[PDB]
Design a protein around this ligand. Sequence first.
Ligand SMILES: [Ca+2]
Ligand SMILES: [Ca+2]
Ligand SMILES: [Ca+2]
Ligand SMILES: [Cl-]
Ligand SMILES: [Cl-]
Ligand SMILES: [Cl-]
Ligand SMILES: [Cl-]
Ligand SMILES: [Cl-]
Ligand SMILES: [Cl-]
Ligand SMILES: [Co+2]
Ligand SMILES: [Co+2]
Ligand code: NA
Lengths: 106, 106, 106
Amino acid sequence: ADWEDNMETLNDNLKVIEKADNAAQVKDALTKMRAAALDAKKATPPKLEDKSPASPEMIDFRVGFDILLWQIHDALCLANEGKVKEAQAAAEQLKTTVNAHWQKYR
Amino acid sequence: ADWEDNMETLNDNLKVIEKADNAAQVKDALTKMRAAALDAKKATPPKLEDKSPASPEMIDFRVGFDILLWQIHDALCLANEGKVKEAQAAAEQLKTTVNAHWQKYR
Amino acid sequence: ADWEDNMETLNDNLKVIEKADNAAQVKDALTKMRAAALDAKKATPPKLEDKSPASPEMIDFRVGFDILLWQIHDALCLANEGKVKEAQAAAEQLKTTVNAHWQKYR
Ligand SMILES: [Ca+2]
Ligand SMILES: [Ca+2]
Ligand SMILES: [Ca+2]
Ligand SMILES: [Cl-]
Ligand SMILES: [Cl-]
Ligand SMILES: [Cl-]
Ligand SMILES: [Cl-]
Ligand SMILES: [Cl-]
Ligand SMILES: [Cl-]
Ligand SMILES: [Co+2]
Ligand SMILES: [Co+2]
Ligand code: NA
């Protein structure tokens, strides 16, 4: 998928997590976010379409999605332990990272 | 160890998992798989030897190994929770991903 | 931060972990290590300033931080489960890897 569509997926699953009722729902949403973030790693965002795929700017873009993947895992590890409210709180940090990525690269 | 030797290591530990009984065996084979996948991520596979190191194809190859690493992680998580049968089923699907990447880039 | 400052951050937190009393301290130090490893993926060791950003040597450099990040993941999952002595044992393995990567690229 396109970068913008992956970003839509990330925001939508953040909403799902915010209203989630159990650990399975959180796990499922975070899995979909992980797939969207790994897919966005292969994309080029609008701001960087005038940069080469291995420019320092594009390497930093990909590393920013690595950062997001490890934050997704923090929430996911909490959810795997059945600690649903803790995982939702952790998803708050994901909102910050996603919004900052949106604003930096759109 | 080059890329093809790492793919062989991955397949060997997949067999080890499929015949394992206790969770420490599965976990040990999965940890060896993680190391092999990380070593393969920094290789150039035979199909892409004529491509620029800065090519989109090489970036896609490396992100594909990140995808494999998170699938390995999911299996490893199931094995850490003592869910031997579930981890072995997860590794059965890993056979597909690993051998798909193998045939794709050999 | 540049590469050597990030490696210093890794080493500082490995010492904090060695001399830690509870799991919260281990978790805090490990989260800092993760942030430094990720940030170092965007850095360039002085002796590689001339190579391409996607040169095989720079790929090697970045994937070496992925290797560290998965070791940190193991230690941090152990610390989140209260397995403090086990987390510290894993961090002692981390020390070896950090020093090897330092020797490789400095
Ligand atoms: Ca759209
Ligand atoms: Ca372009
Ligand atoms: Ca290295
Ligand atoms: Cl939409
Ligand atoms: Cl990268
Ligand atoms: Cl990459
Ligand atoms: Cl140089
Ligand atoms: Cl790259
Ligand atoms: Cl890379
Ligand atoms: Co890269
Ligand atoms: Co995990
Ligand atoms: Na030089």
